[PDB]
Amino acid sequence: TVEQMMKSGEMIRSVCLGKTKVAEELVNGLRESKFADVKELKCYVNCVMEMMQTMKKGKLNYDASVKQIDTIMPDELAGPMRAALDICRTVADGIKNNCDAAYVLLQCLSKNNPKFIFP
Amino acid sequence: TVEQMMKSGEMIRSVCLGKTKVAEELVNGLRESKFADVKELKCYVNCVMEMMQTMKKGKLNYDASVKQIDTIMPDELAGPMRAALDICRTVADGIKNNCDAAYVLLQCLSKNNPKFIFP
């Protein structure tokens, strides 16, 4: 729902901000298709996906991801997010570095979701 | 840490869902402060607390819980949980039913912790 999405996103942001020592201005940039090749930012994205059960050890879990998407997001955002996850399902496969794998997946989702949003 | 909180949380959720036969929809309501008086849900909470060693025989173990919060939770989540634990330390004292005691503690923690999270 809207309220749950906001609560979850707010909590995940503060946890992953703290863990990855990323600059908050760079995190804000992720909603603006600014995707600089910054290690802390890549790892911030990986932390978010791990807290959402979407990636585990640098690999997408499709079923868990969809379960989380449906559980957290209102339909209006979930639907477009699932459709983008389908297009992007294999884009990060075989990328060894977890933070790099998560970032490649994020870039694809943003490129393929007209209603993209991220904590 | 993130990946251990996630692995641990996921396993413990799975075990306690199976044991208590609670509706997962009600378990999800816990994050929205919907503390329905449902036996399976109260016992789900107790199961999770026992698996995390925070309760034994329907009594809070304070030292073990402080340890547990500090070890499993990301610091950003640990602090607020510790403070809520102090405020709620005695709230379940005297309650004979184990599941009921676990639930009373959980409600108090949720009430006194802006950053509340639970498997």
Partners of residue A56 in chain B, C-beta under 8 Å: 3, 6
H or E segment to which residue A60 belongs: strand A59-60
* Domains defined along chain B, listed by start: 1-119 (1.10.238.20)
Tell me the sheet residues that pair with A60: A55
From residue A105, alpha-carbon distances to A84, A85, A87, B90 in Å are: 10, 9, 10, 47
Tell me the sheet residues that pair with B56: B59
Q: Which of A3, A7, A50 sits opposite B6 (nearest CB)?
A: A50
Q: Which residues contact A113 (CB under 8 A, 6 or more apart)?
A: A80, A81, A83, A84
Method used for this model? X-ray
Q: Which of B31, B32, B74 sits opposite A19 (nearest CB)?
A: B74
Q: How far is A67 from chain B (nearest CA, A)?
A: 12
- At residue A18, the 3 state secondary structure works out as helix
DSSP A79-111: HHHHHHHHHHTTTTTT--SHHHHHHHHHHHHHH
Say if residues B6 and A50 touch (Cβ distance below 8 Å): yes
Cβ of B6 within 8 Å of Cβ of A57? The answer is: no
Q: Which residues of B touch A (CB under 8 A)?
A: 2-3, 6, 10, 28, 31-32, 74-77, 115, 117
Partners of residue A47 in chain B, C-beta under 8 Å: 2
